[PDB]
Design a binder for this molecule. Structure first.
Ligand code: BTM
Ligand code: MG
Ligand code: MG
Ligand code: MG
Length: 340
């Protein structure tokens, strides 16, 4: 049973889960990859990797992805969680020099991953491998957009480093803006395209209904994460969380903050349902009888279908993943799967 404070009956009833048929193989291949790239210790991979459900999350999201594309996304995603863990540990241990250097290396590797496939920092080498593979599906223009988006993500993580080091809790609106970057909204939105096999023209992916649907899917996932990961984050002195900003700057109690975050998450669902109709109408309109129109139509339809799947995959992931099971840890401040 999902804890009452985290339960969303509309998701449970109206957003039926989907699972990509490649999932079983994906689970094993990503685990093997984490080991080969030395991203986590062998004993921790054995005990925790599968229980973290990182592949499950992506396999419930990018439905219809060619297996090769799904593999690359899952590897990159598992890398992304490990980076989030490294970032946290660097901050906790006050390793400002190590963080700055990693930051600079990621910016560099992002632009030229091939050159960094065997970097001494296994986190950098892991990054380079997944990004090189991601860069092999679509034209260079998509690769450039992914890079542009991720350069922005890296810098948001830097901003987080300095907030936490300096003991600052962002204001609510400052936070909401930053969160679109720390959650990598536009990266996941970018990845819809290789998943449906088509780089969408700016005029298509920037259609207002496509844009708004894409945004709301991510706002849901990010804010729902905030809601579910709040106890783990409070315990680990993370300050980045919609609820923490509300508690700190709106004088809300924990109870009130949880309530407000819930409300905002719920509004996301019903706002998405409305714009979803417009985005699907757009997909229909693209199908104008031409070969190109049919291609674009089917790709928009698939992408919007996956925007919808993010809701259920992200929802269930927070209840299945070991990542958030802080009640199960002896030291609530130090998750067992992180390198401390
Ligand atoms: C570190 C977590 N993550 C994904 C790697 C960073 C963007 C956000 C996320 C959390 C939970 C579900 C989905 C995404
Ligand atoms: Mg985190
Ligand atoms: Mg984070
Ligand atoms: Mg969180």
């Amino acid at each position: 049973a999902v804890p009452p404070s985290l339960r969303l009956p509309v998701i449970e009833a109206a957003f039926p889960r989907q699972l990509h048929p490649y999932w079983p193989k994906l689970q094993e291949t990503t685990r093997t990859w984490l080991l080969e790239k030395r991203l986590m210790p062998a004993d921790k991979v054995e005990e925790y990797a599968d229980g973290l459900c990182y592949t499950d999350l992506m396999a419930g999201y990018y439905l219809g992805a060619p297996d090769e594309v799904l593999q690359a996304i899952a590897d990159y995603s598992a890398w992304f969680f490990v980076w989030d863990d490294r970032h946290d540990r660097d901050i906790v241990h006050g390793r400002a020099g190590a963080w700055r250097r990693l930051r600079g290396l990621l910016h560099t590797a992002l632009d030229s991953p091939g050159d960094h496939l065997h970097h001494e920092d296994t986190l950098v080498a892991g990054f380079a491998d997944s990004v090189r593979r991601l860069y092999a599906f679509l034209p260079a223009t998509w690769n450039a957009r992914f890079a542009r988006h991720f350069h922005t993500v890296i810098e948001a993580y830097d901003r987080e480093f300095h907030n936490r080091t300096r003991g600052i809790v962002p204001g609510v609106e400052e936070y909401l803006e930053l969160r679109r970057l720390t959650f990598a909204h536009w990266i996941w939105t970018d990845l819809l395209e290789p998943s449906s096999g088509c780089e969408l023209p700016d005029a298509v992916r920037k259609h207002p209904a496509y844009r708004r649907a894409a945004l709301l899917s991510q706002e849901f996932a990010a804010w729902y994460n905030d809601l579910c990961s709040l106890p783990k984050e409070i315990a680990g002195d993370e300050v980045h969380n919609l609820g923490i900003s509300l508690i700190t700057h709106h004088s809300l109690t924990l109870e009130e903050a949880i309530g407000e975050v819930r409300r905002r998450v719920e509004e996301c669902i019903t706002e998405f349902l409305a714009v979803e109709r417009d985005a699907l109408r757009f997909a229909d309109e693209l199908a104008d009888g031409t070969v190109r129109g049919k291609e674009l139509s089917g790709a928009v339809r698939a992408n919007v279908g996956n925007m919808r799947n993010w809701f259920s995959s992200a929802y269930w992931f927070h209840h299945e993943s070991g990542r958030y099971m802080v009640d199960s840890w002896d030291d609530r401040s130090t998750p067992p799967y992180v390198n401390n």
